[PDB]
Amino acid sequence: GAMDIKSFLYQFCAKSQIEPKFDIRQTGPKNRQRFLCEVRVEPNTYIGVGNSTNKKDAEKNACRDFVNYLVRVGKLNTNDVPADAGASGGGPRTGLEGAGMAGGSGQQKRVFDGQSGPQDLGEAYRPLNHDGGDGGNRYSVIDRIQEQRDMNEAEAFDVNAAIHGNWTIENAKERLNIYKQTNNIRDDYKYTPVGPEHARSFLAELSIYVPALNRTVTARESGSNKKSASKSCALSLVRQLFHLNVIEPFSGTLKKKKD
Numbered sequence: 001g002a003m004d005i006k007s008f009l010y011q012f013c014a015k016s017q018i019e020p021k022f023d024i025r026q027t028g029p030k031n032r033q034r035f036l037c038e039v040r041v042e043p044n045t046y047i048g049v050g051n052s053t054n055k056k057d058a059e060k061n062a063c064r065d066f067v068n069y070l071v072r073v074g075k076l077n078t079n080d081v082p083a084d085a086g087a088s089g090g091g092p093r094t095g096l097e098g099a100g101m102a103g104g105s106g107q108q109k110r111v112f113d114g115q116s117g118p119q120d121l122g123e124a125y126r127p128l129n130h131d132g133g134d135g136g137n138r139y140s141v142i143d144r145i146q147e148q149r150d151m152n153e154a155e156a157f158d159v160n161a162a163i164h165g166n167w168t169i170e171n172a173k174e175r176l177n178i179y180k181q182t183n184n185i186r187d188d189y190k191y192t193p194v195g196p197e198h199a200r201s202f203l204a205e206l207s208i209y210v211p212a213l214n215r216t217v218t219a220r221e222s223g224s225n226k227k228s229a230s231k232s233c234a235l236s237l238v239r240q241l242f243h244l245n246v247i248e249p250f251s252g253t254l255k256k257k258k259d
Contacts, residue, residue, distance in 0.1 A: 004060075180209075187208065
């Protein structure tokens with residue numbers, strides 16, 4: 001009902017009332033057998049060669065083969081050419097090649113500090129320590145031991161204090177504390193340290209800061225001790241403050257007089 005590739009060659013030559021002449025040579029290889037179907041066809045300028053193991057299928061090969069020329073000469077049609085996919089192993093891979101790596105570093109970055117040597121004029125002006133205290137002395141709260149006669153008695157004589165106004169040495173110090181507190185002035189005994197044993201002594205000059213009477217009242221005295229210098233320094237100020245004529249008069253109750 002349908003035509004075969006071998007049938008096409010028959011119908012080709014059939015127009016001349018002939019058919020393709022088949023010369024099928026049985027060639028014997030070592031592996032098996034092979035029928036080489038060489039076909040004699042009109043314009044025989046090319047011989048169609050089909051190679052199959054058996055004669056039966058060699059007829060198929062020969063006809064299929066010669067069609068490649070038959071269609072190229074335009075004598076037969078490309079519709080007659082069997083492109084059948086019955087066999088496998090005919091599609092290869094193309095292959096993709098084209099890789100490329102790269103990478104520059106760029107070590108252009110070289111810098112400098114541009115620093116100059118630091119000079120030090122600051123160590124020549126090293127900071128100093130200062131004591132900031134209100135004067136925690138404030139013994140203005142002790143009365144019961146201030147009624148003591150023996151303090152004055154030990155210090156010296158009332159007969160000399162009388163000419164000052166009953167003013168003795170250490171009794172004047174707390175009164176000075178009150179002068180500074182009332183005048184709201186800030187000062188302190190300049191305790192000037194003297195050399196060691198070779199010159200074992202201590203100096204202490206005290207000043208009253210310019211009072212409401214705008215005057216300069218200060219005294220510079222010495223002692224055998226830092227605290228003892230502060231004794232003489234305060235007693236001498238009694239006359240200097242008497243220049244302003246300002247101080248609450250003292251009163252000593254002489255109890256015993258030694259004949």
